[PDB]
Structure 1
């Protein structure tokens, strides 16, 4: 057991799942969660509620490691990314900041047919 107490919280949000990895200041994960980590299975994972549960789980799991304050990073644009942020926001865990890191390419790789009409 580490007992970090100052850390990072990554919210990875897609239209399918939301998944929350909580690392330490050097970015190594500690605990994590997701719609699947909680009981959810199908499309129900990409729920905003599912998200909330995931966030809170990650947060409590991380409390166990004695974490207190955390910087947030948000990647991906998905249902209940924001809900994840709310959850974390009052988990009792302190959010010292949010940041949106969602990656975009400068047009490198051809998307799948699903994603075309843009490259």
Structure 2
């Protein structure tokens, strides 16, 4: 059977399973990759928080939070605390274009979790609020 790049539909029954569970039952790792910080929260499919880790909660301060290594460490910490609650497979939902967009996922993988899908949910207004003016540096 040809691999489908598209995620499974909740309604349409599918045979894809991960440790016996359907796609819509897998825990979700929400990564928020800001410009100066990366925050990772693992939640259950029913939206029950299991683990949380940010670059600041891992000891990094000021500019050191906005690096790849800090996001990787936060990912490892989140993956460890999620492993301690029975999480193996995760669906990654990444929001933002910060330096830790990919390093947090790397840290999650090195912490033992298996990523089955990647979703981007970066906020894109259809021209709502007015952004701030450019910096005159």
d(CA) in 2 for partners of 1:101, 1:69? 20
Residue in 2 aligned with 1:16? 36
Other-structure match for 1:88: 108
In the aligned structure 2, how far is the partner of 1:31 from the partner of 1:39?
A: 17
For residue 12 of structure 1, report the CA deviation from its aligned partner: 0.4
Identify unmatched segments of 5+ residues in structure 2.
1-24
Q: d(CA) in 2 for partners of 1:59 and 1:93? A: 6
Counting strand residues as a fraction of each chain, which structure ranks higher? 1
RMSD: 1.7
* TM-score (normalised: structure 1): 0.86
Q: 2:66 matched to 1:49? A: no
Which entry has the higher C-alpha Rg, 1 or 2? 2
Higher RCO, Cα 8 Å, sep 6+: 1
Q: Which runs of 5+ in 1 are unaligned?
A: none
| Aligned residue among 31, 39, 57 for 1:37 | 57
Structure number having the greater helix percentage:
1
Q: What is the deviation of 1:114?
A: 4.6
SS at match of 2:64: helix
